[PDB]
Paper text:
In Drosophila, an RNase III enzyme Dicer-2 (Dcr-2), aided by its cofactor Loquacious-PD (Loqs-PD), has an important role in generating 21 bp siRNA duplexes from long double-stranded RNAs (dsRNAs). ATP hydrolysis by the helicase domain of Dcr-2 is critical to the successful processing of a long dsRNA into consecutive siRNA duplexes. Here six cryo-electron microscopy (cryo-EM) structures of Drosophila Dcr-2–Loqs-PD in apo and in complex with dsRNA substrate in the absence or in the presence of ATP were captured, illuminating the continuous conformational changes of Dcr-2–Loqs-PD after binding to dsRNA and translocating until forming the active dicing state and cleaving the dsRNA substrate into an siRNA duplex in the post-dicing state. Loqs-PD is a cofactor protein that comprises two dsRBDs that are responsible for recruiting siRNA precursor substrates for Dcr-2.
Similar to human Dicer, the N-terminal helicase region forms the base of the L-shaped structure and the DUF283 domain is located at the corner of the L and just below the catalytic active core. The previously unmodelled linker between the DUF283 and Platform domains (DP-linker) in human Dicer is now well resolved in Dcr-2 as a structural element that interacts with the RNase IIIa domain through two α-helices and one β-strand. The Platform and PAZ domains surrounding the Connector helix sit at the top of the core processing region. The intrinsic RNase III dimer comprising the RIIIDa and RIIIDb domains is located in the centre of the molecule with the insertion domains (RIIIDai and RIIIDbi) sitting in symmetric positions. Compared with the apo state, the overall structures of Dcr-2–Loqs-PD complex undergo major conformational changes when interacting with the dsRNA substrate, especially on the helicase and DUF283 domains.
Author numbering:
A (entry chain A): 1 to 1042, 1120 to 1149, 1169 to 1563, 1604 to 1722
B (entry chain B): 344 to 359
The structure:
């Protein structure tokens, strides 16, 4: 229960906190971290930069001994801080200026960087007020002693006003210069006096090596190798050759050249082009005595290359000849060196031993002892626990020793099993290897491979002696002379391993002159240790009060009504645990500050009562709902003050409900338990709860609902003797009247039609788009109902029997169990043909329906019948339906023409003109028909009829060869049987099922539109109401099935423009003004643009994508989802503002969950009228007048345990005759029995336990709809209302869906669009300090393109939770929460309204790409808004800096590449921070809140997102199919998603190294595994790249 | 001379 928090606050933060308290000097041997502490100490004193000097403005000063140091400091300050920076070094035209422009530039620049001379010139004679300075930090302060200019600058502090002096701190990596150290105490006291502060140095025992630098020591010996003055006959020969070259190098007799003189004018000297060879020869002479001959050879090779470059630069022929002679001499020297190298090493026979012996002879005696000692050290030692490292002094010596050690290690195979060589260099880079030429990457691979344990030896020229954290070598190699204190001490620190060994490489002649040296070095090290031991370091600071001393006597615990005891000892632990509960960026938790109060402030706030006592204040981080500080009551000691402060803070936290009765911080599950009865109440009646104990597998994703017909269709059977309404149906052919479509085209325009007879009036319906085989059809229902009266019951019976006959015979939608639905129930409407009656008023066509109660059987005819039966008249066949009985009995065949001019004796029309009709018929037939009787009569041209019944497909299957093949259909009239049915009426009836199916849902859409408009109080509008003209349905064609000072000088002007200067030199359109307002936003404020709600939109919102309809419901789903998300976010932010971001986000996710939407739509009674099943009419459709037997349905509806075993085979077991199916209705008792005992046999058969419901649901009125479709339906309805009436009206409709609870006290669910951001009245403090925090906010607002009326919102949006100084505003997470929804909706509405050609479903991917956190970070960095984030966290600092460098390397391009693969590395270490992306959302929310103008907020957002909105719409990046199809170029191997149902949801398997290496990943979300696979593929590509 | 002086196992690592 006692979680440990072992002082996690960083030493850098502690040092900076100490520096702001008082003056001091900080000393850190570690090379890194001094820049960060300098940046923080600059930022702490950074306010009051904007104010002018005359009104009390202050500036900051940087001091560096060398100009390169100043340049690096300036670069770091630019990259890390949002302050204008100057750079004034040496004689850059600064001393020739005037006082007025000094003042002007002090106006221009805030922080000014320079060296000592410029600053002494500035202060002494062009005096700028030292009192007008904020902070003066200096670097390598140990340089300043005696007459050093740092001493003078510090002495000037004694003349000016000592009560207004600025703060001075001196950074240093070494306390002493390291040359020679005597009288350590005197020098350190002098350094203490020079800068008015103490030396502070961390003593952490965890990762800093400070304490181990003095608490440990290895054994100390020297090799004591003998050595004399170096002499070599080859060196003598080289000297003689150089002398021979020089005695002739005085007679070049070259042409006249300009005279070159030395800077000091001591004597005349040769020009550089002539003395370069002399300088290189002198360097090589120096090198041979120090390096050897292999390094001499490589150096002379470099000299040869430089000579070649210079000769290419040279032009004179005599100079070319002299240079060629010099090149010949250098080549001869190189040849001699390489000859010696290749000859001495193998001058014996026994290669295996001589290869090592020569190296023991090649090496100098020091290196000889080195090699033999290493040999005897690794004679048999295991390579598991051995590691050492070589220190040298020269960069080239690293490579030389590397070559020597390579030759040595390859010579001895025994050490190859234990020893591995490397070599490392810094400046003046030479080719080290075949990879990573750059020094930085070479050293990075160096450190990673060494720390990974792959290698155990390298050579560095004091490169790693700077204080690198490499593995502690058990032994240290120092070949070069060690006459320097600092590098000696750091080298000894490299030997921190306990009981380790260290050797010294000193000659015998050198020993007597270095033993005393090592003596003062060691005693000075000890003296420095004992001098720093008594300083007030971090450990001695009150930060080490975690020991919790026993002082419980004078402090009391707390108990509540629950009786739980709150022990004050556990206060720190429970506060830390609570700080763990609040959301964080995973960059470590935030620990409350414990700043100690000064005695003067203590008396100011308390007075005499606190005299002699200590009090502490806790700065609860802005993330927690506590924002004000807490002051501890006074008592004696600091530890008890901290305990009392923590106890009081815990009491306050409990008082406000962040802790339960058990005094433990609450969790999300505990918090949502307080919201279940307020928001998620409706879940109770369905057996579910918001607790969600189990998920995933236990969820059932299918449910069955009882479909219901529209109220117009219910009880719509016409009566007898009562008025009845007939709505004529018109079919408009939109295709051109081609000859191929002539029969289709002409027959659709005939006056004869059929009408839907209803007992209830029908509303106006939209125009119906249909697609026949020939082309598109337009269908509309007559607006005016043709009222009629039924005379007698027999007329009604004839109507109903004709209705049954049409379906049974013409359409053949029949099953053995169908019976006429005589009773008045759902879908009781009828279809009645219409004919032209008296006048222009059409009347019922009783003649046809009297003679066509049932189609006559397709009777054949023997040859006897024709010769005895009279031939039919030619006019009887015009526009009728015939049947070629002798070839296809059941095929109905349509007559389109009569040919009185053709006889059976006539020949073929085409392609077989040698054949006549008679002989053709008698050759392909003749059996079962005899011959033809009338060989002289007429003929018929007939055209086929399609068997399709679903006409919701745009695509066609017409073929040209088929087009000629079709019109050649010619038949003998007496050999075919005609029904005497009008062809036009038949061809119109063939479209009846699709029309009825679409109208069945058009009625539902109309009723739902009426209800929605009635609720929204817009029904009285002229657009709506009885005057509404529905627009024709729209086809969704989008659906698939339808030095370098020049650079710094040219950067100086940009420094005047600051880092904030957005380049804008080239538009992002080159990779290869006024903004248009949103229509929804436009109609949100003004009612002039309120478009009427079309019923076509609602019908589109009803029909799911499962059906094959021409329009889909998914497109509205995106807008509805985004609007619902925004509304939930704003509603929760307004209702609960004290909550932290985590619980708000969780509750928002819970409100928009699919389960919540489904449960809040089920009680809305909406899903029972959805179109979500493909319309196959021949198998899964119930015609209106057609139904199951009444007894069968009565038994069905009463025995569910029996209703779950009825099967389709048992349904065809029913044998219904015409009598049962027509008159009686109910099934016969015998058949009812046979069925009931036949169906029960399924249990005794293999059919037992099958899924009968999925095949017989249509017979009952049930349907299975997946859980996703219901939520999609609610979202689509939301989206269509938003699109039509705008946000201002669509906000209050969520009250209808009871998603958002209506507040009885105030109708605020309408005004929620203008709610504030939380606590604002308590922050009306003076704006001067707000401006102080917001340094250079003008440039931030300019880049963001919006000037803030109130700067408070900007400060809140820029406040990272790891920032203690801010105390008036909350963190940025609260604003980011709102900004997320604001941006999401403002981008979703834009893409939905503006992009229509884009495929629905791809819009979702586009929206995800736009809202992606990596994209947000890219936008934020591109506009350089990151400089203004107020944070104090190191690891976040370098991660942000690295991400900024990576972004700028690409020019802020958003063209795919690598960071989209690094998307996995969001919150292999992280490479993109969430705070950087989220600050943009916070800024967007601040922009909206300041102005309350959605249109202006859209202006800002569009101006931000214009380039990526252009690019992404052009080609949208995708994730899932992207990772599916990009790998298959050479890696088609994949795996199924393994669902886990735990903290991690999914796992995936894949292969690396193209195919031969199998690597698998895991994922806490669906795409997490794919992104992990993407990063593994990226790493493989890096291996391919490497 | 590139030969220097040959030394063998008769070596000492003497204390400072």
């Amino acid at each position: 229960m006692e979680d440990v928090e072992i002082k996690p606050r960083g030493y850098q933060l502690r040092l900076v906190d100490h520096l702001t308290k008082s003056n001091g000097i900080v000393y850190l041997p570690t090379g890194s971290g001094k820049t960060f502490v300098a940046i923080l100490v600059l930022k702490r004193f950074s306010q009051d930069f904007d104010k002018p000097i005359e009104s009390g403005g202050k500036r900051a000063l940087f001091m560096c001994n060398t100009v390169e140091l100043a340049r690096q400091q300036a670069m770091a300050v630019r990259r890390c801080t949002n302050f204008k920076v100057g750079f004034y070094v040496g004689e850059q035209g600064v001393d020739d200026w005037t006082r007025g422009m000094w003042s002007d530039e002090i106006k221009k620049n805030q922080v000014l960087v320079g060296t000592a001379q410029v600053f002494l010139d500035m202060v002494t004679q062009t005096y700028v007020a030292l009192s007008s300075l904020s902070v003066v930090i200096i670097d390598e302060c140990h340089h300043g002693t005696g007459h050093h200019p740092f001493r003078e600058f510090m002495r000037l502090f004694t003349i000016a006003n000592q009560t207004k002096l600025p703060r001075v701190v001196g950074l240093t990596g070494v306390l002493i210069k390291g040359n020679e150290i005597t009288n350590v105490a005197t020098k350190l006291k002098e350094l203490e006096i020079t800068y008015r502060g103490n030396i502070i140095t961390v003593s952490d025992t965890k990762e800093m090596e400070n304490v181990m630098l003095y608490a440990t020591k290895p054994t100390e010996v020297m090799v004591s190798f003998p050595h004399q003055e170096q002499v070599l006959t080859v060196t003598r020969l080289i000297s003689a050759e150089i002398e021979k070259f020089y005695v002739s190098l005085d007679l070049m007799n070259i042409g006249v050249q300009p005279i070159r003189r030395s800077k000091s004018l001591q004597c005349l000297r040769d020009p550089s082009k002539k003395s370069f060879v002399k300088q290189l020869f002198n360097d090589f002479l120096y090198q041979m005595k120090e390096y050897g001959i292999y390094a001499a050879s490589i150096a002379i090779i470099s000299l040869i290359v430089e000579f070649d470059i210079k000769r290419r630069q040279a032009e004179t022929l005599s100079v070319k000849l002299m240079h060629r002679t010099a090149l010949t001499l250098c080549e001869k020297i190189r040849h001699l060196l390489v000859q010696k190298l290749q000859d001495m090493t193998y001058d014996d026979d026994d290669d295996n031993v001589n290869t090592e012996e020569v190296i023991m002879n090649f090496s100098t005696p020091k290196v000889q002892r080195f090699l033999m000692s290493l040999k005897v050290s690794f004679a048999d030692k295991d390579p598991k626990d051995i590691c050492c490292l070589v220190f040298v002094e020269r960069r080239y010596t690293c490579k030389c020793i590397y070559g020597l050690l390579l030759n040595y290690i390859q010579s001895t195979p025994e050490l190859r099993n234990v020893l591995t060589p490397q070599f490392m260099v810094g400046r003046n880079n030479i080719s080290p290897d075949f990879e990573s030429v750059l020094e930085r990457k070479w050293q990075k691979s160096a450190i990673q491979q060494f720390r990974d344990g792959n290698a155990n030896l390298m050579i560095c020229s004091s490169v790693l002696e700077e204080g690198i954290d490499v593995q502690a070598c058990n032994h240290v190699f120092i070949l070069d002379p060690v006459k320097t204190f600092n590098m000696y001490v750091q080298s000894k620190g490299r030997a921190r391993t306990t009981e380790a060994k260290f050797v010294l490489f000193t000659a015998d002649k050198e020993r007597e002159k270095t033993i005393q040296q090592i003596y003062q070095y060691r005693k000075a090290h000890n003296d420095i240790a004992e001098y720093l031991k008594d300083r007030v370091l971090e450990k001695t600071e009150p930060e080490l009060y975690e020991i919790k001393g026993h002082f419980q006597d004078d402090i009391d615990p707390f108990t509540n009504e629950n009786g739980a005891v709150l022990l004050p000892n556990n206060a720190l632990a429970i506060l830390h645990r609570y700080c763990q509960t609040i959301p964080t960026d995973a960059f470590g938790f935030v620990i409350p500050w414990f700043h100690v109060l000064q005695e003067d402030e203590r008396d100011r706030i308390f007075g005499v009562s606190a005299k002699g006592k200590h009090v502490i204040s806790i700065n609860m981080p802005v993330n927690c709902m506590l924002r004000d500080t807490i002051y501890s009551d006074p008592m004696d000691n600091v530890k008890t003050a901290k305990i009392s402060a923590a106890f009081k803070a815990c009491k306050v936290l409990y008082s406000l409900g962040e802790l339960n009765e058990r005094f433990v911080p609450k969790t999300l599950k505990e918090r949502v338990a307080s919201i279940a009865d307020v928001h998620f109440e409706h879940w109770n009646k369905y057996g579910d709860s918001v607790t969600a104990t189990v998920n995933k597998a236990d969820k059932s994703k299918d449910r069955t609902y009882k479909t219901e017909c529209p109220l117009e269709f219910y009880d719509a059977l016409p009566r007898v003797g009562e008025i009845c309404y007939a709505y004529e149906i018109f079919l408009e052919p939109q295709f051109e009247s081609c000859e191929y479509t002539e029969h289709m085209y002409l027959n659709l325009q005939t006056p004869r039609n059929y009408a839907i007879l209803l007992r209830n009036k029908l509303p106006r319906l939209a125009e119906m788009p249909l697609f026949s085989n020939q082309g598109k059809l337009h269908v509309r229902v007559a607006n005016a109902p043709l009222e009629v009266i039924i005379q007698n019951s027999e007329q009604l019976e004839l109507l109903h029997q004709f209705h049954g006959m049409v379906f049974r015979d013409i359409l053949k939608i029949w099953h053995p169990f169908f019976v006429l639905d005589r009773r008045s129930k759902e879908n009781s409407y009828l279809v009645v043909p219409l004919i032209l009656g008296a006048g222009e008023q059409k009347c019922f066509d009783w003649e046809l329906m009297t003679n066509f109660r049932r189609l006559p059987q397709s009777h054949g005819s023997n040859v006897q019948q024709r010769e005895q039966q009279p031939a039919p008249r030619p006019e009887d066949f015009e526009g009728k339906i015939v049947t070629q009985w002798y070839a296809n009995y059941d095929k109905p065949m349509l007559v389109t023409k009569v040919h009185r001019e053709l006889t059976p004796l006539s020949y073929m029309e085409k392609n077989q003109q040698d054949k006549t009709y008679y002989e053709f018929t008698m050759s392909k037939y003749g059996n079962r028909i005899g011959d033809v009787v009338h060989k002289d009569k007429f003929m018929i041209e007939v055209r086929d009829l399609t068997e399709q019944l679903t006409f919701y497909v745009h695509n066609r299957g017409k073929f040209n060869a088929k087009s000629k093949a079709k019109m050649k259909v010619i038949l003998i009239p007496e050999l075919c049987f005609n029904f005497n049915f009008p062809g036009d009426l038949w061809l119109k009836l063939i479209f009846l099922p699709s029309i009825l199916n679409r109208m069945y849902f058009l009625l539902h859409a109309e009723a739902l539109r009426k209800r929605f408009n009635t609720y929204l109080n817009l029904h009285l509008l002229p657009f709506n109401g009885t005057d509404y003209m529905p627009r024709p349905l729209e086809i969704d064609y989008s659906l698939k099935r339808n030095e370098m000072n020049e650079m710094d000088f040219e950067d100086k002007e940009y420094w005047a423009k600051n880092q904030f200067h957005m380049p804008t030199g080239n538009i992002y359109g080159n990779r290869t003004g006024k903004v248009k307002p949103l229509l929804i936003l436009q109609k949100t404020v003004s009612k002039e643009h309120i478009t009427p709600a079309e019923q076509g939109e609602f019908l589109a919102a009803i029909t799911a994508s499962s059906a094959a309809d021409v329009f889909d419901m998914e497109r509205l789903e995106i807008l509805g989802n985004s609007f619902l998300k925004l509304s939930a976010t704003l509603y929760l932010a307004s209702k609960y503002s004290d909550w932290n971001e985590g619980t708000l986000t969780e509750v928002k996710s819970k409100l928009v969950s699919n389960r919540n939407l489904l449960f809040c739509l089920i009680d809305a009674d909406i899903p029972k009228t959805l179109n979500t099943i493909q319309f196959t009419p021949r198998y899964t459709w119930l015609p209106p007048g057609i139904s199951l037997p009444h007894n069968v349905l009565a038994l069905w509806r009463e025995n569910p345990e029996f209703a779950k075993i009825i099967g389709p085979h048992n349904l065809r077991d029913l044998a219904l005759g015409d009598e049962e199916s027509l008159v009686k209705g109910n099934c016969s008792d015998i058949n009812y029995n046979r069925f009931v005992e036949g169906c029960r046999a399924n249990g005794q058969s293999f059919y037992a336990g099958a899924d009968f419901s999925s095949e017989v649901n249509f017979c009952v009125g049930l349907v299975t709809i997946p859980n996703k479709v219901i939520a999609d339906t609610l979202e689509a309805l939301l989206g269509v209302i938003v699109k039509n009436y705008g946000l201002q009206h669509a906000f209050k409709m969520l009250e209808y869906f009871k998603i958002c609870r209506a507040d009885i006290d105030k109708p605020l669910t309408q005004l929620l669009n203008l709610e504030l951001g939380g606590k604002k009245m308590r922050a009306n403090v003076n704006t001067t300090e707000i401006d102080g925090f917001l340094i250079n906010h003008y440039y931030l607002e300019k880049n963001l393109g919006y000037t803030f009326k109130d700067r408070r919102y900007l400060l809140q949006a820029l406040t990272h939770p790891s920032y203690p100084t801010n105390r008036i505003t909350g963190s940025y997470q609260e604003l980011e929460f709102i900004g997320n929804a604001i941006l999401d909706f403002l981008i979703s509405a834009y893409i939905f309204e503006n992009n229509t050609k884009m495929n629905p479903g791809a819009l979702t991917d586009l929206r995800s790409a736009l809202v992606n956190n990596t994209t947000l970070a890219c936008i934020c960095v591109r506009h350089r808004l990151h400089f203004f984030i107020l944070a104090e966290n190191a690891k976040l600092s370098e991660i942000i800096s690295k991400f900024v460098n990576f972004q700028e390397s690409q020019g802020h391009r958003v063209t795919n590449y690598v960071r989209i693969l690094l998307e996995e590395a969001d919150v292999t270490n992280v490479d993109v921070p969430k705070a950087l992306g989220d600050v943009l959302e916070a800024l967007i929310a601040a922009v909206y809140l300041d102005c309350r103008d959605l249109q202006r907020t859209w202006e800002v957002i569009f101006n931000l997102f214009e380039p990526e909105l252009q690019e992404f719409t052009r080609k949208v990046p995708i994730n899932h199919i992207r990772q599916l199809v990009e790998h298959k170029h050479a890696k088609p191997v994949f795996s199924s998603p393994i669902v886990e149902g735990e903290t991690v949801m999914v796992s995936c398997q894949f292969t690396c190294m193209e195919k031969t290496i199998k690597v698998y990943g895991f994922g806490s979300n669906k795409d997490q595994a794919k992104l992990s696979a993407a990063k593994h593929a990226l790493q493989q590509l890096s291996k391919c790249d490497a | 001379i590139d030969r220097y002086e040959q030394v063998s196992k008769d070596f000492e690592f003497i204390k400072i």
